[PDB]
C-alpha cells in the first residue's frame, strides 16, 4: 500500500507531467550512497516513499560506520541492533562481557529478521533515540 | 495518547484553588424541581 495515510506520500519536488503519455508514469528518484556499498534493486525500483531511507530519502550517510545484530523489529522502519564487545577493566587483569543496543532506522527495501548481521552508518538526528541508518544487511 | 485522554486524576493546587463558595440560589428549589417537571416536556 502506497497511500496508507491522510497525506499524499511522495518525495518532494518530483513532477511527472500528465501532458506527456509516457509508459513509466511514476517517476522515482534515488542516489548512489557509495562508501563501499551497493544500491539494491528493490530500493531503486520499489514503490515506497521514505525520507529516512539512506538510498531514496533525503538523509545522507556520513561519519562512523558500525556493525550490529538484529534483536527486536517491533517498531515501524526502525530496528535496535546489538553491539557486542569487551570491556577495559583494571582491577582483576581481564575483560568484562558487555553489550550495547543501538536503535537504527531501516529502509523497507531490505528484508530483515532477528539475528541478521547489519552494517549501519551515522546520519543526522531524526528522533530522540535514533541516530544511525542501515546500509547493508547480511543473513545468518 | 499525548494529551487526548480523560483520566480522573487528582490535582494538588486546584482542589484548594478557590472552593468553597456561596449558596446563591434565588429560590429554594422546591418549586424549581416541579418546574423542571413542568418544562417543555409537558
Amino acid at each position: 500500500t502506497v497511500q496508507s495515510e491522510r497525506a499524499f506520500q511522495k518525495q518532494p519536488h518530483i513532477f511527472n507531467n500528465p501532458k506527456v503519455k509516457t509508459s513509466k508514469r511514476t517517476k522515482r528518484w534515488y542516489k548512489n550512497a557509495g562508501l563501499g556499498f551497493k544500491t539494491p534493486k528493490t530500493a531503486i525500483e520499489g514503490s515506497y516513499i521514505d525520507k529516512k531511507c539512506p538510498f531514496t530519502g533525503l538523509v545522507s550517510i556520513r561519519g562512523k560506520i558500525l556493525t550490529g545484530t538484529v534483536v527486536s523489529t517491533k517498531m515501524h522502519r526502525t530496528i535496535v541492533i546489538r553491539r557486542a564487545y569487551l570491556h577495559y577493566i583494571p582491577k582483576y587483569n581481564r575483560y568484562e562481557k558487555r553489550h550495547k543496543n543501538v536503535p537504527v532506522h531501516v529502509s523497507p527495501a531490505f528484508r530483515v529478521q532477528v539475528g541478521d548481521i547489519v552494517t549501519v552508518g551515522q546520519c543526522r538526528p531524526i528522533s530522540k533515540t535514533v541516530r544511525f541508518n542501515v546500509v547493508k544487511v547480511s543473513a545468518a | 495518547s499525548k494529551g487526548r485522554k480523560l483520566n480522573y486524576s487528582v490535582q494538588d493546587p486546584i482542589a484548594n484553588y478557590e472552593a468553597p463558595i456561596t449558596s446563591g440560589y434565588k429560590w429554594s428549589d422546591d418549586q424549581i424541581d416541579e418546574f423542571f417537571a413542568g418544562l417543555l416536556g409537558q
Binding site: - | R4, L6, V10, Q11, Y17, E18, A19, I21, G24, F35
Partner: protein
C-alpha cells in the same frame, strides 16, 4: 467621535477615524508622519474577547500578536499591565470580583490559569475546546469540547467527575443561568439543550427551525435576559429568536442583517423597558427594544467586530475586534457617562454644538 444614525445620537468615543478600504496600519503611519480618553487604548494587531471585572474597574482583554492580555484600570486610565501567554486565547472569564483569578480556554486544546502572583499551571483537555463556562454556585469549570463531550472540573476535588453528553459534532455556544441555575447549550444542528445540576440530568432539547432559504442555522448566541426567565438564541442569517422559559414559541421573532453571522446578543435594563443588542459580522450592532422588538438604534463602525460587552452601569459598549484600536461606544440615549469618565457628557455637548 462622530454619529451614525439621524434621529438618535450615538458616539464612538474611540475608533478608526478612517472609515473603510484605507487600511489602518498605513493610515496610522501616514497620520503620525503628517481626543483619546484612556492611555494606550489600542493593540495594533487584533483582539479576541473582553470581560470587565465585577468591580467595574478592570478591563481585561486578549490580543493576538505574541498573544497577550491587556489589563486596564479605569482609575489609572492606562495599562494596569500587559502579559504574554503562548497561544491566542479564545475564551476567558475572571472568576473573582477583582482580576486576581482568571481562567481561559486556550486554543492549543488546553485551559490556563492567570493569577495575581503569576500563572498557575496549564491543564490539557482531551478534545478541542469549544466553550467553557464557570458555574459559581457549585464551583465548576465545565467546557463543551469538540463534538460529543462537555467535560467538567470541580474546584474542591480537582478531578473530572463526568463529561456531559451533547449528541452533536459541535458545541457552538454554552451559557449558565443563575437566577435559575440551569445549563444551556446551543448547537448549529438546530438543537438546544438545557441541563440540570445537583441531579445530573438533561431536562430540555428543542429548537429545530428553518430560515426563508431553507438552510440549517448556526446558533452563535445563546444568552438570556436580566430576569433569568426569557432566553435569546441567535444565528447566522441575522436571525434572533427570544423565547420564554418553558414554551416552544419564541416571544420575539426577528430577521435582519445578512448572511454574515451575528455574534452576540445582550440585554439592557433601561429605566422602564428592556433593550437588546445584536452584534454581527456585517460590521453592525443594532439596539432594539424588546417590548416592540424594534431596532431603535444602529451603529456601524465600518469595520467588523468580534465581541461586545456593556458596562454594568450604563452607556459604554466595549468591542474587541481585529483592528488596531479595541473600540468602545457611548450611548446617551440610555444613560450618562460612568463615574470615571465624567467629562464625556461635556464632550457630548461639544459634539452637539459642533
Amino acid at each position: 467621535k462622530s454619529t451614525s444614525a439621524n434621529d438618535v445620537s450615538v458616539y464612538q468615543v474611540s475608533g478608526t477615524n478612517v472609515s473603510r478600504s484605507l487600511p489602518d496600519w498605513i493610515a496610522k503611519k501616514r497620520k503620525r508622519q503628517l481626543v483619546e480618553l484612556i492611555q494606550d487604548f489600542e493593540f495594533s494587531e487584533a483582539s479576541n474577547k473582553i470581560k470587565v471585572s465585577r468591580d467595574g474597574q478592570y478591563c481585561m482583554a486578549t490580543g493576538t500578536y505574541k498573544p497577550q492580555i491587556h489589563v486596564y484600570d479605569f482609575a489609572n486610565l492606562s495599562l494596569k499591565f500587559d502579559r504574554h501567554t503562548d497561544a491566542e486565547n479564545v475564551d476567558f472569564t475572571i472568576l473573582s470580583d477583582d482580576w486576581t483569578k482568571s481562567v481561559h480556554l486556550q486554543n492549543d486544546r488546553s485551559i490556563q490559569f492567570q493569577n495575581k502572583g503569576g500563572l498557575h499551571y496549564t491543564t490539557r483537555i482531551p478534545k478541542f475546546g469549544r466553550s467553557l463556562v464557570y458555574n459559581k454556585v457549585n464551583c465548576d469549570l465545565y467546557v463543551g469540547a469538540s463534538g460529543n463531550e462537555l467535560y467538567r472540573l470541580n474546584l474542591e476535588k480537582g478531578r473530572f467527575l463526568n463529561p456531559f453528553k451533547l449528541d452533536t459534532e459541535g458545541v457552538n455556544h454554552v451559557s449558565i443561568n443563575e437566577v435559575n441555575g440551569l445549563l444551556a447549550a446551543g448547537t448549529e444542528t438546530n438543537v438546544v439543550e438545557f441541563w440540570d445540576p445537583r441531579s445530573r440530568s438533561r431536562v430540555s432539547k428543542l429548537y429545530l427551525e428553518n430560515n426563508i432559504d431553507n438552510r440549517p442555522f448556526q446558533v452563535t448566541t445563546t444568552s438570556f435576559r436580566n430576569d433569568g426567565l426569557t432566553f435569546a438564541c441567535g444565528t447566522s442569517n441575522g436571525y434572533s429568536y427570544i423565547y420564554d422559559l418553558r414554551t416552544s414559541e419564541p416571544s420575539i421573532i426577528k430577521d435582519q442583517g445578512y448572511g454574515f453571522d451575528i455574534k452576540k446578543i445582550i440585554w439592557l435594563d433601561n429605566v422602564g423597558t428592556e433593550n437588546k443588542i445584536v452584534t454581527c459580522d456585517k460590521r453592525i450592532a443594532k439596539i432594539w427594544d424588546r417590548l416592540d422588538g424594534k431596532a431603535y438604534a444602529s451603529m456601524e463602525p465600518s469595520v467588523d467586530i468580534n465581541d461586545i460587552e456593556h458596562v454594568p452601569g450604563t452607556g459604554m459598549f466595549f468591542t474587541a475586534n481585529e483592528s488596531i484600536p479595541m473600540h468602545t461606544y457611548y450611548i446617551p440615549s440610555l444613560g450618562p457617562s460612568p463615574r470615571w469618565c465624567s467629562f464625556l457628557d461635556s464632550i457630548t455637548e461639544e459634539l452637539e454644538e459642533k
